[PDB]
Amino acid sequence: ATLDSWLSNEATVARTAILNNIGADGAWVSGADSGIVVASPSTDNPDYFYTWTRDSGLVIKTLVDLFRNGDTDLLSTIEHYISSQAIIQGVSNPSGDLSSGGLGEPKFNVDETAYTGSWGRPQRDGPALRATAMIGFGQWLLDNGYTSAATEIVWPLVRNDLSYVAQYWNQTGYDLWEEVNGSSFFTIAVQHRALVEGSAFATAVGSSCSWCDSQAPQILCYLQSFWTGSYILANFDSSRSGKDTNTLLGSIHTFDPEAGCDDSTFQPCSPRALANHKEVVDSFRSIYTLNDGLSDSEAVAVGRYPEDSYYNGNPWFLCTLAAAEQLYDALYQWDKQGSLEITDVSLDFFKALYSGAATGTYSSSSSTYSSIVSAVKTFADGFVSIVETHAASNGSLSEQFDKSDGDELSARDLTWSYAALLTANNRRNSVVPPSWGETSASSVPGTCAATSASGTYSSVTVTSWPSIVA
Ligand SMILES: *[C@@H]1O[C@H](CO)[C@@H](O[C@@H]2O[C@H](CO)[C@@H](O[C@@H]3O[C@H](CO[C@H]4O[C@H](CO)[C@@H](O)[C@H](O[C@H]5O[C@H](CO)[C@@H](O)[C@H](O)[C@@H]5O)[C@@H]4O)[C@@H](O)[C@H](O[C@H]4O[C@H](CO)[C@@H](O)[C@H](O)[C@@H]4O[C@H]4O[C@H](CO)[C@@H](O)[C@H](O)[C@@H]4O[C@H]4O[C@H](CO)[C@@H](O)[C@H](O)[C@@H]4O)[C@@H]3O)[C@H](O)[C@H]2NC(C)=O)[C@H](O)[C@H]1NC(C)=O
Ligand SMILES: *[C@@H]1O[C@H](CO)[C@@H](O[C@@H]2O[C@H](CO)[C@@H](O[C@@H]3O[C@H](CO)[C@@H](O)[C@H](O[C@H]4O[C@H](CO)[C@@H](O)[C@H](O)[C@@H]4O[C@H]4O[C@H](CO)[C@@H](O)[C@H](O)[C@@H]4O)[C@@H]3O)[C@H](O)[C@H]2NC(C)=O)[C@H](O)[C@H]1NC(C)=O
Ligand SMILES: C[C@H]1O[C@H](O[C@H]2[C@H](O)[C@@H](O)[C@@H](O[C@H]3[C@H](O)[C@@H](O)[C@H](O)O[C@@H]3CO)O[C@@H]2CO)[C@H](O)[C@@H](O)[C@@H]1N[C@H]1C=C(CO)[C@@H](O)[C@H](O)[C@H]1O
Ligand SMILES: *[C@H]1O[C@H](CO)[C@@H](O)[C@H](O)[C@@H]1O
Ligand SMILES: *[C@H]1O[C@H](CO)[C@@H](O)[C@H](O)[C@@H]1O
Ligand SMILES: *[C@H]1O[C@H](CO)[C@@H](O)[C@H](O)[C@@H]1O
Ligand SMILES: *[C@H]1O[C@H](CO)[C@@H](O)[C@H](O)[C@@H]1O
Numbered sequence: 371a372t373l374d375s376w377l378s379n380e381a382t383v384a385r386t387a388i389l390n391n392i393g394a395d396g397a398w399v400s401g402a403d404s405g406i407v408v409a410s411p412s413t414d415n416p417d418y419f420y421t422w423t424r425d426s427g428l429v430i431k432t433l434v435d436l437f438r439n440g441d442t443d444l445l446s447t448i449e450h451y452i453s454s455q456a457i458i459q460g461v462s463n464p465s466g467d468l469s470s471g472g473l474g475e476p477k478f479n480v481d482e483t484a485y486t487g488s489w490g491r492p493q494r495d496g497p498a499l500r501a502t503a504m505i506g507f508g509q510w511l512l513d514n515g516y517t518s519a520a521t522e523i524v525w526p527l528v529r530n531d532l533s534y535v536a537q538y539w540n541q542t543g544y545d546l547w548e549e550v551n552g553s554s555f556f557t558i559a560v561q562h563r564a565l566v567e568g569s570a571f572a573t574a575v576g577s578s579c580s581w582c583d584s585q586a587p588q589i590l591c592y593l594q595s596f597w598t599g600s601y602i603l604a605n606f607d608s609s610r611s612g613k614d615t616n617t618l619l620g621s622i623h624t625f626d627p628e629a630g631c632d633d634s635t636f637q638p639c640s641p642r643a644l645a646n647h648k649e650v651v652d653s654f655r656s657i658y659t660l661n662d663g664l665s666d667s668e669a670v671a672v673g674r675y676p677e678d679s680y681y682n683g684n685p686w687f688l689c690t691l692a693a694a695e696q697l698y699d700a701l702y703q704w705d706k707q708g709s710l711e712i713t714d715v716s717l718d719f720f721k722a723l724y725s726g727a728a729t730g731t732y733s734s735s736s737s738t739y740s741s742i743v744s745a746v747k748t749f750a751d752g753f754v755s756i757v758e759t760h761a762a763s764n765g766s767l768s769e770q771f772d773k774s775d776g777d778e779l780s781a782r783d784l785t786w787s788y789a790a791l792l793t794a795n796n797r798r799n800s801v802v803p804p805s806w807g808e809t810s811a812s813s814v815p816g817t818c819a820a821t822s823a824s825g826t827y828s829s830v831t832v833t834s835w836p837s838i839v840a
């Protein structure tokens with residue numbers, strides 16, 4: 371009713387707002403070079419007029435998926451991004467050069483110059499995210515007969531990022547929130563994915579990624595350590611509880627539509643990800659006045675972590691959208707499978723929504739199933755309603771919304787907020803991303819080793835783009 375139509379409208383707004391934030395024709399970011407995704411046009415309090423590898427990677431992957439689904443007009447935006455990355459990779463910065471750690475640098479100026487002040491650096495998710503976004507585009511180029519562009523432009527760029535991940539995964543750094551110096555689930559999860567799809571891509575182009583192959587299994591091995599028995603620990607080397615939407619993000623950004631409810635990869639429907647889901651969301655129920663009065667079977671406004679004090683610690687549009695997207699993903703998986711399972715690990719999650727929940731296997735034709743799935747859908751939609759309630763009248767999505775009154779705060783028109791909107795809508799409509807090979811990369815080795823593999827680095831120069839038609 372309100373929701374479906376609001377989403378339809380918001381999706382259009384979200385696409386437009388992202389384009390306005392990408393150089394060099396982006397309406398909100400004059401000064402940004404060609405293909406530079408700006409986090410936000412906000413240049414003062416806060417100053418987000420920079421380009422983050424993470425934000426850009428996430429945004430572009432989203433645009434790539436839209437493109438592959440028929441949004442052909444996004445072609446030049448993607449080409450520009452790729453071209454810009456060829457340059458950025460080579461920018462000498464506080465984290466190093468191309469071959470000596472440069473790839474890990476969190477953000478840059480919109481003009482493609484290094485940001486030299488103090489920052490929580492490096493952030494090792496970046497390279498993984500940029501690689502995943504490029505690989506998707508690379509796959510389309512292969513499928514549509516533009517092998518050369520894939521082999522000579524995309525591969526070489528990806529190869530740099532894959533080498534970095536394989537080389538430093540087992541080293542500390544900052545989390546996606548840029549505040550904890552340690553080992554972060556989100557980072558580890560996206561790094562394992564990148565290596566697996568990086569390897570398949572390498573083969574597709576007639577090359578190889580030996581370092582992708584030796585390291586992926588080891589990253590996976592390590593990933594298991596994040597399960598505490600009741601939830602996913604966001605970070606090692608932290609004094610916090612460990613409950614963080616970092617873990618929801620890790621799950622949705624590594625969702626493979628071909629995968630079952632695999633615990634080893636923390637898929638959306640896995641018992642571990644469902645138990646984690648409740649523990650995370652529940653942590654925001656009594657700390658935000660905006661959540662006052664809601665029951666345990668009701669959607670709530672979700673922040674980053676319960677201990678957050680950034681701008682006082684408020685819910686985030688993207689964190690709230692992620693809580694819904696994980697559910698949309700699990701619905702798709704159960705439906706595709708033709709059953710859902712309730713285990714001791716995930717009982718609390720189900721029991722909060724369907725009080726008659728009991729462990730066992732429920733086929734898609736069973737009454738229990740119908741009852742659970744409707745309840746899950748209503749819950750998932752509830753998170754999206756909170757978003758709709760607090761968005762600006764014209765559809766503007768901010769970074770945060772006030773924990774007490776829901777007013778928008780922090781960076782305005784946050785590009786990441788817009789991409790999160792698109793992906794949650796997509797999943798809601800059963801529009802899923804291409805598979806990354808999870809079905810051949812969920813086996814955990816019997817012994818985890820603290821290791822690395824060094825790949826190879828080489829500077830890429832993009833002379834010209836072939837005249838691609840879509
Ligand atoms: C839905 O409607 C919304 C409501 O109208 C609409 O949002 C509005 O969009 C306009 C842009 O179209 C915004 O205008 C900008 O305002 C800047 C000042 O903002 C502060 O003051 C406002 C007035 O009191 C506040 O309302 C505003 O609050 C918002 O932002 C807060 C912080 O993020 C947030 O917490 C609040 O909740 C609220 O959301 C804020 O406090 C003003 O500075 C800016 O001017 C620049 O941009 C113009 C062009 O876009 C230029 O002509 C102008 O000269 C300035 O250019 C400089 O900055 C640009 C980047 O933004 C650069 O591209 C330029 O190159 C240039 O940069 C120079 O300076 C930099 C210094 O740091 C430097 O880094 C550069 O290198 C360079 O040297 C513009 O006027 C307005 O703020 C929005 N209002 C609200 C309430 O959000 C929204 O877009 C609509 N949505 C949709 C989907 O349509
Ligand atoms: C490089 O790779 C190696 C190999 O994979 C990594 O080594 C593994 O590291 C993990 C994490 O330290 C380690 O797991 C610990 O094992 C201990 C016993 O075997 C546990 O006592 C410890 O418990 C913590 O995590 C649990 C979840 O697994 C929680 O239930 C528990 O509450 C503990 O969590 C608290 O304490 C930790 C302290 O570690 C703190 O940081 C948290 O924030 C939280 O407060 C772990 O389970 C494996 O045993 C190691 N494996 C091997 C073979 O040595 C190495 O960590 C990698 N390094 C980097 C930088 O990436
Ligand atoms: C944008 C970012 O802002 C906050 O963190 C910043 C500090 O504001 C900044 O001053 C700097 O802090 C270092 C400090 O200057 C130095 O004196 C001290 O030694 O070390 C500090 C490093 O810990 O850098 C940090 C970032 O490292 C918030 O705490 C961050 O959560 C916030 N990140 C946002 C913004 C973006 C852009 O969209 C997202 O990529 C990110 O996920 C999100 O959390
Ligand atoms: C993930 O992949 C492993 C192999 O790596 C399978 O054994 C598992 O069933 C799942 O498909
Ligand atoms: C499943 O496959 C992994 C490699 O992907 C092995 O390390 C594991 O022991 C199991 O055979
Ligand atoms: C880390 O450890 C593995 C095996 O223990 C090695 O093969 C690798 O070269 C690195 O030293
Ligand atoms: C990654 O780090 C390992 C340490 O285990 C080295 O052996 C390897 O050569 C690469 O530097």
Ligand SMILES: *[C@H]1O[C@H](CO)[C@@H](O)[C@H](O)[C@@H]1O
Binds near residue numbers: 537826827
């Ligand atoms: C890791 O080490 C290799 C050598 O095995 C280098 O080629 C690479 O650039 C990185 O330093």
Ligand SMILES: *[C@H]1O[C@H](CO)[C@@H](O)[C@H](O)[C@@H]1O
Binds near residue numbers: 825826828
């Ligand atoms: C590592 O490998 C690449 C690809 O073979 C080389 O181009 C690079 O110079 C380094 O030797």
Ligand SMILES: *[C@H]1O[C@H](CO)[C@@H](O)[C@H](O)[C@@H]1O
Binds near residue numbers: 830
């Ligand atoms: C390493 O590889 C890149 C990508 O092909 C080249 O541009 C560079 O000349 C070196 O051979």
Ligand SMILES: *[C@H]1O[C@H](CO)[C@@H](O)[C@H](O)[C@@H]1O
Binds near residue numbers: 458828
């Ligand atoms: C690869 O790196 C070189 C510098 O090492 C740059 O000149 C080139 O633009 C590309 O980024």
Ligand SMILES: *[C@H]1O[C@H](CO)[C@@H](O)[C@H](O)[C@@H]1O
Binds near residue numbers: 828829830831832
């Ligand atoms: C791409 O190729 C040029 C040579 O045409 C280099 O100068 C650049 O650093 C990158 O390797």
Ligand SMILES: *[C@H]1O[C@H](CO)[C@@H](O)[C@H](O)[C@@H]1O
Binds near residue numbers: 831832833834
């Ligand atoms: C266009 O031209 C430059 C100069 O030969 C190359 O380095 C680049 O890889 C592309 O082929």
